Amino acid sequence: KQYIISEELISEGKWVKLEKTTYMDPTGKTRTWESVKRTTRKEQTADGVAVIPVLQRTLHYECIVLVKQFRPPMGGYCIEFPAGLIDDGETPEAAALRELEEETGYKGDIAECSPAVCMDPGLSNCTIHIVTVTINGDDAENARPKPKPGDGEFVEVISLPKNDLLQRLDALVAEEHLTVDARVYSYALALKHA
Amino acid sequence: KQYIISEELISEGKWVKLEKTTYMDPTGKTRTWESVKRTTRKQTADGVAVIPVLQRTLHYECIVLVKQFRPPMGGYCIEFPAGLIDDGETPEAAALRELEEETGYKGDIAECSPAVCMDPGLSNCTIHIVTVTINGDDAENARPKPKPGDGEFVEVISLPKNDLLQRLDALVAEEHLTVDARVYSYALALKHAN
Numbered sequence: 509k510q511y512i513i514s515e516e517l518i519s520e521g522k523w524v525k526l527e528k529t530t531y532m533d534p535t536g537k538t539r540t541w542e543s544v545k546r547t548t549r550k551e552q553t554a555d556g557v558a559v560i561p562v563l564q565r566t567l568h569y570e571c572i573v574l575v576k577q578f579r580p581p582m583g584g585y586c587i588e589f590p591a592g593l594i595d596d597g598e599t600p601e602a603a604a605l606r607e608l609e610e611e612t613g614y615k616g617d618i619a620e621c622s623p624a625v626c627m628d629p630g631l632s633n634c635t636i637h638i639v640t641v642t643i644n645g646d647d648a649e650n651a652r653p654k655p656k657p658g659d660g661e662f663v664e665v666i667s668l669p670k671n672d673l674l675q676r677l678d679a680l681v682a683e684e685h686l687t688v689d690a691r692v693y694s695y696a697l698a699l700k701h702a
Numbered sequence: 703k704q705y706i707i708s709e710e711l712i713s714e715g716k717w718v719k720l721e722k723t724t725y726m727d728p729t730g731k732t733r734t735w736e737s738v739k740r741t742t743r744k745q746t747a748d749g750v751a752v753i754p755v756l757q758r759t760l761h762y763e764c765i766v767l768v769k770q771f772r773p774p775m776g777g778y779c780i781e782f783p784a785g786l787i788d789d790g791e792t793p794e795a796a797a798l799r800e801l802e803e804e805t806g807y808k809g810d811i812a813e814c815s816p817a818v819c820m821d822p823g824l825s826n827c828t829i830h831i832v833t834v835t836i837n838g839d840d841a842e843n844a845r846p847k848p849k850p851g852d853g854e855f856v857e858v859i860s861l862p863k864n865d866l867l868q869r870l871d872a873l874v875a876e877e878h879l880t881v882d883a884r885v886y887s888y889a890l891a892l893k894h895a896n
């Protein structure tokens with residue numbers, strides 16, 4: 509029934525643009541919407557990846573590896589899955605493994621890769637693949653992992669046991685000014701609910 | 703250590719604005735970021751998203767989701783029921799309200815998250831995730847009445863909780879829909895639990 513009629517550029521930065529979207533509603537009426545897009549998306553199947561990194565070690569409970577960094581749009585520190593945009597010609601899986609190593613120091617093994625999923629679809633066209641990766645924390649490569657932050661990247665690693673993730677996140681929110689990502693929270697909630 | 707120095711308005715629409723944020727990086731170097739914000743924030747958060755657990759005796763427990771055309775996406779998306787919080791509305795009340803408007807179901811609040819971020823490298827947008835149970839055996843949830851506001855057009859899709867990820871994957875492959883990242887994250891964790 510519904511579909512896009514036109515997309516008009518309102519304003520274009522280096523990284524983000526705003527568009528006036530005209531679309532057909534299901535009654536047959538023409539309507540508009542204000543849409544955010546990135547300018548960096550080329551032939552990739554999504555803008556980025558987010559990594560669900562399950563750190564596995566003998567005689568340890570599994571941990572979910574998270575990152576904390578200052579996010580200028582939020583004006584503060586956020587706890588998130590490791591994540592980055594996909595380079596031109598790069599696969600989602602390669603992007604995931606690369607960002608996970610850059611942000612955390614860990615070398616993961618691919619487990620699964622989602623289809624492109626939408627970040628905030630009432631506002632933007634932005635999409636990611638969520639890539640689940642296991643980390644063999646008994647491997648010597650993963651013994652004392654050091655982040656390789658890029659230019660302007662400043663990332664702290666937080667590994668939380670999977671079996672208590674929601675409470676551990678809540679404890680972090682209680683003891684500090686910082687925001688948990690909605691995908692991380694959704695993941696922690698389902699772990700409780702299961 | 704890092705903080706915001708100033709925010710420059712680039713473009714302001716009715717619903718969304720684009721800003722250039724100046725911030726201090728941890729090395730002491732001043733840097734810029736392009737940031738999106740909504741023009742509607744008042745509240746605890748921009749919006750709510752509802753995790754609606756449909757409980758009917760002798761049936762599988764279902765998660766109730768919604769399918770809508772999303773103009774920024776140019777396509778249809780599957781999401782948790784959700785909307786913006788009305789000025790002077792509590793998150794819990796916004797959750798029950800949106801759930802009724804979008805699905806027709808009348809639910810009970812189980813728990814409510816702190817404000818969590820939507821896409822923190824792009825925007826300041828935040829929501830509360832509100833877990834709600836729905837007694838599907840009550841008369842008020844027999845023939846649920848969806849009350850769409852002006853221009854909203856929503857289809858309701860209930861999927862079994864214990865199979866959610868496989869059911870979503872199927873909807874993507876066969877219906878060319880985009881699943882929301884929070885929904886996908888929830889589904890993954892249901893599989894990853896234990």
Ligand SMILES: Cc1cc(C(=O)Nc2ccn(C)n2)on1
Binds near residue numbers: 540541717718853
């Ligand atoms: C973001 C975002 C949300 C909307 C939206 O519903 N816009 C409407 C509805 C009625 N008018 C006059 N504009 O557009 N962009």
Ligand SMILES: [Cl-]
Binds near residue numbers: 701755812833835
């Ligand atoms: Cl529940």
Ligand SMILES: [Mg+2]
Binds near residue numbers: 591611
């Ligand atoms: Mg990153």
Ligand SMILES: [Mg+2]
Binds near residue numbers: 592607
């Ligand atoms: Mg990165």
Ligand SMILES: [Mg+2]
Binds near residue numbers: 783784785804
């Ligand atoms: Mg809605």
Ligand SMILES: [Mg+2]
Binds near residue numbers: 785800
């Ligand atoms: Mg509504």
